[PDB]
Design an enzyme around this catalytic site. Structure first.
Site, PDB file in Angstrom:
ATOM      1  N   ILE A   1       0.855  -1.183   0.000  1.00  0.00           N
ATOM      2  CA  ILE A   1       0.000   0.000   0.000  1.00  0.00           C
ATOM      3  C   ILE A   1       0.893   1.235   0.000  1.00  0.00           C
ATOM      4  CG2 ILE A   1      -1.681   1.309   1.398  1.00  0.00           C
ATOM      5  CD1 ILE A   1      -1.861  -2.049   2.400  1.00  0.00           C
TER       6      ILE A   1
ATOM      7  N   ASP B   1      10.861  -5.293 -16.615  1.00  0.00           N
ATOM      8  CA  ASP B   1       9.436  -5.087 -16.393  1.00  0.00           C
ATOM      9  C   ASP B   1       8.975  -3.626 -16.289  1.00  0.00           C
ATOM     10  OD1 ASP B   1       6.808  -6.314 -16.140  1.00  0.00           O
ATOM     11  OD2 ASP B   1       7.064  -6.363 -13.933  1.00  0.00           O
TER      12      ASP B   1
HETATM   13  O1  1V5 Z   1       6.275   2.740  -4.993  1.00  0.00           O
HETATM   14  C1  1V5 Z   1       5.294   2.696  -5.738  1.00  0.00           C
HETATM   15  N1  1V5 Z   1       5.007   1.592  -6.441  1.00  0.00           N
HETATM   16  C2  1V5 Z   1       5.751   0.352  -6.307  1.00  0.00           C
HETATM   17  C3  1V5 Z   1       5.510  -0.382  -5.023  1.00  0.00           C
HETATM   18  C4  1V5 Z   1       4.393   0.010  -4.276  1.00  0.00           C
HETATM   19  C5  1V5 Z   1       4.111  -0.602  -3.064  1.00  0.00           C
HETATM   20  C6  1V5 Z   1       4.939  -1.588  -2.566  1.00  0.00           C
HETATM   21  F1  1V5 Z   1       4.626  -2.147  -1.362  1.00  0.00           F
HETATM   22  C7  1V5 Z   1       6.061  -1.980  -3.291  1.00  0.00           C
HETATM   23  C8  1V5 Z   1       6.364  -1.383  -4.517  1.00  0.00           C
HETATM   24  C9  1V5 Z   1       6.141  -0.421  -7.555  1.00  0.00           C
HETATM   25  C10 1V5 Z   1       7.193   0.406  -6.819  1.00  0.00           C
HETATM   26  C11 1V5 Z   1       4.428   3.908  -5.978  1.00  0.00           C
HETATM   27  C12 1V5 Z   1       3.091   3.763  -6.360  1.00  0.00           C
HETATM   28  C13 1V5 Z   1       2.314   4.884  -6.600  1.00  0.00           C
HETATM   29  C14 1V5 Z   1       2.847   6.164  -6.491  1.00  0.00           C
HETATM   30  N2  1V5 Z   1       2.069   7.245  -6.748  1.00  0.00           N
HETATM   31  C15 1V5 Z   1       2.552   8.504  -6.629  1.00  0.00           C
HETATM   32  N3  1V5 Z   1       1.784   9.592  -6.861  1.00  0.00           N
HETATM   33  C16 1V5 Z   1       0.392   9.496  -7.209  1.00  0.00           C
HETATM   34  C17 1V5 Z   1       0.236   9.594  -8.731  1.00  0.00           C
HETATM   35  C18 1V5 Z   1      -1.226   9.388  -9.061  1.00  0.00           C
HETATM   36  C19 1V5 Z   1      -2.056  10.497  -8.404  1.00  0.00           C
HETATM   37  O2  1V5 Z   1      -3.412  10.295  -8.772  1.00  0.00           O
HETATM   38  C20 1V5 Z   1      -1.877  10.488  -6.887  1.00  0.00           C
HETATM   39  C21 1V5 Z   1      -0.404  10.596  -6.515  1.00  0.00           C
HETATM   40  C22 1V5 Z   1       3.876   8.706  -6.246  1.00  0.00           C
HETATM   41  N4  1V5 Z   1       4.628   9.809  -6.058  1.00  0.00           N
HETATM   42  C23 1V5 Z   1       5.864   9.409  -5.705  1.00  0.00           C
HETATM   43  C24 1V5 Z   1       5.856   8.061  -5.667  1.00  0.00           C
HETATM   44  N5  1V5 Z   1       4.650   7.634  -6.014  1.00  0.00           N
HETATM   45  C25 1V5 Z   1       4.164   6.325  -6.091  1.00  0.00           C
HETATM   46  C26 1V5 Z   1       4.958   5.195  -5.854  1.00  0.00           C
END
Ligand code: 1V5
Length: 354
Positions: A35, A147
């Protein structure tokens, strides 16, 4: 202080236990591996993303992934790779260790959302250039992704693009023929994925949306054509039979796959051209990796090279601490110790008597 006290919040069916500096937590994903919440960082006075990895040592695959992520996020510092602001665990011993939290700067959008927009050549080119920069940066440290996909890429309001993860309801659509067919691979495995993202940006449709690998391979050959006998001969005998037994397809030219009508409206006299985008697509979406472009050649392509800056495209490689990411096997308990050590090493690099 806000930096050493924890509090707990319920986020759906899970408990987030984080430093009090992180306020007003709101879920922003995800599924499968954990999450992710947006929060306000009251110390930095800005917004962050916080992901919880639950029991990353639970099996070899989660473990090796969590470990790679921690090590690489830490040693990489590049415009096009998500940076690491903070890492912590609320648990107070190796025995009790369950969860790892990783903190990143919050980005406004993800690439799935950006792809759905009506884009122009300027922004398509710039996004692609940046993806290629991030990929080349990883490749310079011997890291090959395999990937890359839009849900794991984020984008700032000013179009700055950052790749969120380091490589391989899971999304298979962007994976190269090498991966699908269980072949050997090299760096340009990642260029196939970039081609799939680029193609999707243009046509507003996932290019190879198979329900499984069989369906996905079928969509590849139906559109690009059955590969040539020289490629077939490269397949290991147990896979070659399957591939050679599929119905044969001529495929479509890239002018048929990506006609002008799919490109930005009223763009016939832009600095960049649909024909250049189509040419680049035709060199990335090449089934036989030995005939597919390299990242370097992609960076020099007319559709991309407008943005070329050596500080972004020829940055000093990341330094992976000596032998830290070798090929070695480890037990679940060994992985658990390795990940715990990495989390605690973060504190060891910060604590001071001044
Ligand atoms: O770390 C993220 N995803 C991964 C992951 C996620 C959870 C995990 F337990 C292990 C790996 C694949 C790496 C992730 C996911 C959504 C992420 N979403 C972000 N921003 C959103 C973009 C969409 C908008 O609607 C709301 C803010 C954002 N800003 C900096 C990092 N992030 C995000 C990082």
């Amino acid at each position: 202080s806000l930096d050493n006290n924890f509090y707990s919040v319920e986020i759906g069916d899970s408990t987030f236990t984080v430093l009090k500096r992180y306020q007003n937590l709101k879920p922003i994903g995800s599924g499968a591996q954990g999450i992710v919440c947006a929060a306000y960082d009251a110390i930095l006075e800005r917004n962050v993303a916080i992901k919880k990895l639950s029991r990353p040592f639970q099996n070899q695959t989660h473990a090796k992934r969590a470990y790679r992520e921690l090590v690489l996020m830490k040693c990489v510092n590049h415009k096009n790779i998500i940076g690491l602001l903070n890492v912590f665990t609320p648990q107070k011993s190796l025995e009790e260790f369950q969860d790892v939290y990783i903190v990143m700067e919050l980005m406004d959008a993800n690439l799935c959302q950006v792809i759905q927009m009506e884009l122009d050549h300027e922004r398509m080119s710039y996004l692609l250039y940046q993806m290629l920069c991030g990929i080349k940066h990883l490749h310079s440290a011997g890291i090959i992704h395999r990937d890359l996909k839009p849900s794991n890429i984020v984008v700032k309001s000013d179009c700055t693009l950052k790749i969120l993860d380091f490589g391989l309801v899971v999304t298979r659509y962007y994976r190269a023929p090498e991966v699908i067919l269980g072949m050997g691979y090299k760096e340009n495995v990642d260029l196939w994925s970039v081609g799939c993202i680029m193609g999707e940006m243009v046509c507003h449709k996932i290019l190879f949306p198979g329900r499984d690998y069989i369906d996905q391979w079928n969509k590849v050959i139906e559109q690009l054509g059955t590969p040539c006998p020289e490629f077939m001969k490269k397949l290991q005998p147990t896979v070659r039979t399957y591939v050679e037994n599929r119905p044969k397809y001529a495929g479509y030219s890239f002018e048929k796959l990506f006609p002008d009508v799919l490109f930005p409206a009223d763009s016939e006299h832009n600095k960049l051209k649909a024909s250049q985008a189509r040419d680049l697509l035709s060199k990335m979406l090449v089934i036989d990796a030995s005939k597919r472009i390299s990242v370097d050649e992609a960076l020099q392509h007319p559709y991309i090279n407008v943005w070329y800056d050596p500080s972004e495209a020829e940055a000093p490689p990341p330094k992976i601490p000596d032998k830290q990411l070798d090929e070695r096997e480890h037990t679940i308990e060994e992985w658990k110790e390795l990940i715990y050590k990495e989390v605690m090493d973060w504190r060891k690099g910060i604590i001071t008597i001044t």
